[PDB]
Symmetry: D2
Subunit: 322 residues, 4 copies
């Protein structure tokens, strides 16, 4: 399996130059399942894990770029906070999960990597146990080659979006988007609608015609040199957190607030932000260019800064010891 793919020449996005030693069976991808390190290709879970049958779980995703894992501490904090709200117990400390995660990456030998930690309600002594008190919660962790929500070419030159005609985001009182979850029924439906409409992605609205988020990303808009991102029906994203910190360092006002359907359509810039590929300019909405139809200046400034962070020793990154 490829550990690299093309990125625009000279751009802020470049994979590491290195060779993996495939004499190790862990080379290229690792999972940690029921306390054992496995080749990613061998990684299997009980079909009776209620994380399958009820999607009764939470998770987080972190990236590794140039051998640096990005904000793992913040990822573990959000994961464990969510698990606590779901009455889940990983049975491992934050530092224990940090060491297991870093070991997955190290065994993979991947310098660019998509890293998942999942906590499930789990399974009991026999299949089809339904008393939560009898289910042993499971931790599953994996590190695999880098995943792009949008290809490198779109990270640099922009993607396109539609607002679905047929779908809205599940609200915080249904399948709660503020706890990261695998329940993508609405997100999958929106993505199918964007693909059918020839667009790169979908931006979903909440029940009150406020911007929610997209399938695997938060949305930020810029209007009159100010940045806004949805406060209610949206994951509290760590990329969004990073974007707000960059904006403050640049003297750009950044508010978490309701962004109405009016404000989305009237935006000077629209961007997608996510762990899986960073900051994506959205050049077009429902076939209408935003600004001049190319990546906006705040979006370009913040994106370029984001990728620079992956090479600057400091609290946001930790070097994997390969």
């Amino acid at each position: 399996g490829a550990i690299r793919e093309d990125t625009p020449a000279g751009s802020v996005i470049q994979y590491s130059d290195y060779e993996i030693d495939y004499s190790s069976p862990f080379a290229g991808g690792v999972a940690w399942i029921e306390g054992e390190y496995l080749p990613a290709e061998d990684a299997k879970i009980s079909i009776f894990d209620t994380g399958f049958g009820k999607s009764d779980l939470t998770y987080t995703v972190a990236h590794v770029w140039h051998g640096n894992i990005f904000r793992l501490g913040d990822h573990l904090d959000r994961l464990l906070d969510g698990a606590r709200k779901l009455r889940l117990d990983p049975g491992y400390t934050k530092d224990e999960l940090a060491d297991i995660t870093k070991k997955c990456v190290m065994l993979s030998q991947l310098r660019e990597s998509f890293v998942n930690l999942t906590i499930t309600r789990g399974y009991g002594k026999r299949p089809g146990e339904r008393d939560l008190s009898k289910l042993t919660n499971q931790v599953y962790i994996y590190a695999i080659p880098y995943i792009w929500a949008f290809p490198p070419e779109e990270q640099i030159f922009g993607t396109t979006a539609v607002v679905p005609r047929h779908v809205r985001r599940a609200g915080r009182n249904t399948v709660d988007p503020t706890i990261k979850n695998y329940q993508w029924g609405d997100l999958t439906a929106a993505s199918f609608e964007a693909k059918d409409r020839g667009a790169g992605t979908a931006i979903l609205m909440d029940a009150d015609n406020c911007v929610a988020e997209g399938p695997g990303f938060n949305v930020c808009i810029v209007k009159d040199g100010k940045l806004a991102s949805p406060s209610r029906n949206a994951l509290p994203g760590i990329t969004r957190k990073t974007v707000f910190e960059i904006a403050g360092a640049m003297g750009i006002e950044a508010a978490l607030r309701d962004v109405t359907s009016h404000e989305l359509y009237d935006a000077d810039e629209i961007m997608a932000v996510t762990t899986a590929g960073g900051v994506t300019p959205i050049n077009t909405l429902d076939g209408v260019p935003i600004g001049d139809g190319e990546p906006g200046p705040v979006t370009v400034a913040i994106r370029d800064r984001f990728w620079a962070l992956m090479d600057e020793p400091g609290p946001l990154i930790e070097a994997i010891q390969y």
Copy 2:
């Protein structure tokens, strides 16, 4: 256990039989990636997007006294939803039926919970995102009978609350009209019902119409007529059976919007699901429905439902063990 206690003399009784545990299939079978496995060995790829995106549909049938109930109706529903999700099981209705009946026959269970699941599946590499590159998977299993409500509550009734904090996901979000594993709202509602000391929750939709419950449809009776939600609810096969029973009894039955006012004013409320049948709901938010005991229409339909499992006819098929 292949059995649990049921109220003595009640319409609910497990079969009296011995399983041969020399078979590694005894008590539980799964069919995964084209192979029959002991249930305890049944594992799937972590990279199946049926896990990472819950991108799948399923159905559940029951086996009672060695008889599988409305399997053809379950496969029709399963395959119709799969077509709506752009999934392809890569097996015919008849092929899935044979594989399903073989899982039960190998389990040796006369009372069984039978699941068929169709997932978007996995590509050649973990982290394939391109749907055209994902090979859809079928997983089938037959395990001991599962009760959405204990047998004691099937006969004596359960208690319900309407969540203060949760609503059922709408058909335009995580669509409840296609059976799915995305129980975020249903799990939250169950925890609230448990926190309040109730047997279960009845969730409303965005317009304060009844949706359904965690693993069941709701039916009400008012002035001798039955009604069940049409919009934000699974089209249940137990509900289908209940409407047929009602028809045969001369009782009008409508699939329609049931408002919050109508739920609270109901003469009777009942839960209906594959996993345990027809459950009387005695109280709603601590207020007795009728006299706070199983209603007369509910009892008549529940008892008729169980009688169907022993009557030769087109709704049942005997597993040939």
Copy 3:
């Protein structure tokens, strides 16, 4: 009167009004008195104003015939019951006063409004509902078109709002006819801004609700459907379903999803104020061939014929 298309099924009556009557052209009945429409005034302290605490119905008169007045009175009084309003008159008394307004107006084509408000007490600013006297206001004025005659015959255009949805049955309930048009007014402004004839609003689950002053019906594969939930139970819709049945056309009150609206073979607006309006395009996309559909035309032409045919649906005003 105003222009209608030459030779079409819509034609005003040929007659002259005697303007020696101060009632000629418009009559209201307010606080037990018939008045010229030009003089019809209500107390500002009617809570029908300050809380929009009221229901109403609208009937039309065409060629001197009032259409389904009994059904209109039934619907008005049923909603007034749900609102705990009491008009303090019987159905037959209201029917007599209604026909008298039309007669005094001399209008052969007329828009007829019956409103029941929560009313006012002895003191402005009375808030105790038990101390408010409910009020009945009735008027008959020249015919009002939700769509012009030209659009009745040749069709209009619609958009689905980007920014607005219909209030649900559990908020400001559309199943009880009301003056609370905040959403409908926002949707109409959005359609105007977007160069469209009108708006079709969605409910919270992306099911068709209705439009600003009309129900929506679709045709798909020769079958008619109209929303069952977040929509007024229209008397034009009731008529359309009776016409469809008599034509051998299957007609269902059910949820119509956003998918089914956009995929429809035909779309129509139905309302008392102008009848059955073909909708040629939705968000700029032609419905069928972008001209009034065959079911829509058959039902619209039948609807206008019902106005002139003696029977239970019509009663001739005695002028």
Copy 4:
């Protein structure tokens, strides 16, 4: 006119005599450019402010002869009118002059004051073109209206969350622009009355607190104040409450308040022009804290009433 208030409480009507030889005594409306006695105030049945409730308004109170925050009221009224494409055809200063004259002619020292801007009517009844409708301004000053009785202001009221009704969302009948469209509020009030409660607190579509029938809701938890930011009127009483909270060193946030946070609150209060700050002792029959007015609610309520007598920029004495 006055009614009983609790003896020695922070709420007391003025002691004074109206001269009823003026026909304006006790109540005045300003309709179609004419000052009228309230009893004679009538509007065209064809104003689309009636038939479409196509209007906005605001309500100010007069207490001890002082009108409270009229400029804020006028700013909020006119901002909402611009959003509705309404034009009063009067300046903020002209509307202020007309408002204060209604109060002066009424002789009321305690008054409920309404300013309404409607889409209006055309030359013909039933005119269908908005561009041909002349927008109307209607203003009145009448005796003080209480959302909750003085006894409840001092000793607290009770509330329920409706089983059957929710607040209309900002994308339907928008609660962020003051309106007469009370269909949900009226239904909620009927359900509270059926359940024997003082009032209803409505939720939005996501089970966040919206507001009540004529008031904003504020909660206190762990000594901090919160009030809904989305589906709720931007109240001037709420604005005052937040200024009073800041002055007292009490953290106050406009934010989503979940249904969890409402039921878990240490204090709940109703805030509105028509009676001020009302303690809510009980929710769905369960005591909030000890089932008596909470300490933050009492300190803010008493401060709010003291404001009506302190010379300062929030009040203007009516020159009778």
